[PDB]
């Protein structure tokens with residue numbers, strides 16, 4: 351789904367205000383109040399991280415505004431979330447400047463913007479339960495497989511392929527960094543992933559020279575960016591949660607309409623148990639994820655710290671404070 | 672089994688966030704999100720209850736990390752459990768500070784930390800069905816007697832004796848507070864101990880400077896500490912249960928592998944019956960424990976309150992909610 355000539359040209363003339371050049375470097379930066387700038391913000395981060403000679407200003411602006419277009423008006427898995435995630439990966443890549451190959455940095459920031467392309471606001475579980483055409487196409491990591499698929503289609507549009515100045519092998523390489531990274535955002539896969547990385551980091555056997563070991567780390571970085579609203583400041587964190595549950599509950603409404611009981615997480619009638627559900631989630635998913643990332647990459651510390659601060663706020667909510 | 676100097680030297684210089692300080696004092700405090708800070712949480716706890724002048728910093732840090740290194744990689748009875756039991760004691764001691772001697776508070780915090788030392792993840796009943804080495808050596812309270820053997824072995828490790836500077840009277844005295852405390856964590860003994868204290872209280876004959884009554888109160892404090900996952904907020908409690916059964920089921924699987932049927936508690940093909948087992952455990956073991964403890968030590972009331980809360984949560988799980 352292509353962008354207009356008017357859109358990518360409008361993006362070429364954007365310059366970020368100076369009073370946000372500092373803040374964009376903070377892990378806890380909330381893009382919320384700056385909706386008009388989200389695409390320019392991505393260009394900014396892409397230029398800081400990869401430089402202004404990495405992608406042709408024209409081709410890159412096409413890509414971005416097409417990507418924008420191929421995100422839906424779903425309550426959570428929408429354009430805003432793509433740019434929240436891409437950003438976190440920016441902050442992560444910045445604070446680890448000399449560890450990732452040049453091709454990795456390009457691939458990952460792209461992979462992050464594209465990671466939830468054409469999301470319908472329905473879990474993988476849902477699409478398989480009700481024999482959705484997408485579940486027919488891809489049996490496992492259903493939405494994720496589709497997101498990679500969507501990405502490759504946007505690059506194959508006219509003047510959109512931003513990887514034009516690379517060999518066939520370097521282009522083969524990057525479309526695999528992007529593949530693995532998006533497939534990593536399937537949270538079901540995360541659990542296994544983080545478990546092996548734990549084992550490895552302990553026994554001292556974590557080899558960054560190893561390729562399959564690198565994939566696993568990018569894998570956890572992907573999850574870590576995916577969940578990053580658990581690492582914003584409390585009023586930002588509160589608001590994204592409402593977006594998360596609006597989407598969940600909408601899926602459960604669709605399930606009910608068919609005379610089928612959704613799990614309690616997708617039922618509006620159980621609104622009161624959100625604080626507990628969050629605490630449960632922080633404790634079972636978020637903390638481990640960020641605890642391990644901080645181990646592997648010390649500079650990511652502010653992520654865990656912010657997660658711990660949000661954890662306590664939910665605790666306070668549960669306790670009536 | 673000794674530890675390495677890398678670990679203990681690090682512990683020495685650790686300092687604790689100002690926000691946690693206010694919250695470690697709470698009964699509901701969950702230590703889960705802070706795995707790195709656990710060894711230093713104990714240090715803080717000792718210093719606040721016993722004084723910064725009470726132990727020589729270096730000998731303590733050595734003790735703690737070697738205790739840590741002697742806890743196994745088992746699902747429940749592991750390092751995290753030790754530090755939680757110890758934190759529950761802390762909060763009980765702090766709320767009843769003058770009722771106990773400095774020697775009792777020293778020993779009880781340390782006895783809580785070392786109480787499951789070297790747990791393999793097999794119950795007393797297993798070892799004594801399957802004639803284990805340890806069961807021929809210790810025939811009653813089998814594992815607990817081993818956990819005390821372990822504590823002393825860590826005190827007898829060179830450079831680890833934190834009680835070196837007590838008088839000779841006090842030294843054999845503190846090791847007896849510790850011996851009794853660990854032994855009392857054998858749940859088999861608890862029901863008798865509980866029934867007795869419950870009797871003495873009702874007929875106004877409970878007397879704190881009667882040493883045998885005193886030892887009985889201490890033992891019950893130990894059980895109340897040992898079970899404290901049931902006093903945490905629901906999602907904390909729920910997550911721990913998983914770890915418990917994850918360990919019970921690993922033991923049933925061993926009996927099955929050997930060809931003998933485990934009790935329903937240790938059989939995973941009977942998960943269905945978990946909420947009803949938790950129901951009865953709360954009604955038969957847990958409530959009675961915190962009920963009687965609150966009668967003897969009224970400032971422990973928040974423990975009964977939280978436990979009743981989770982009893983209500985388990986009653987709701989049964990009822991299909």
Ligand SMILES: c1ccc(-c2c[nH]c(CCc3cnc4ccccc4n3)n2)cc1
Pocket residue numbers: 576577578579580591594614615620621623624626627628630631
């Ligand atoms: C009632 C209400 C919520 C829950 C419940 C269970 N689990 C969760 C977590 C929801 C969730 C999922 N994914 C997230 C990603 C990023 C940030 C927050 C998230 N919260 N919520 C269960 C019953």
Ligand SMILES: c1ccc(-c2c[nH]c(CCc3cnc4ccccc4n3)n2)cc1
Pocket residue numbers: 897898899900901912915935936937941942944945946947948949952
């Ligand atoms: C099937 C499943 C479980 C049970 C069953 C019986 N009794 C229990 C309680 C297990 C237990 C033991 N120790 C605990 C300590 C702290 C918190 C919870 C605990 N639960 N569970 C019986 C049949």
Ligand SMILES: [Mg+2]
Pocket residue numbers: 465466493494535536
């Ligand atoms: Mg996704």
Ligand SMILES: [Mg+2]
Pocket residue numbers: 786787814815856857
């Ligand atoms: Mg034990």
Ligand SMILES: [Zn+2]
Pocket residue numbers: 431435465466535576
């Ligand atoms: Zn996402």
Ligand SMILES: [Zn+2]
Pocket residue numbers: 748752756786787856897
């Ligand atoms: Zn224990």
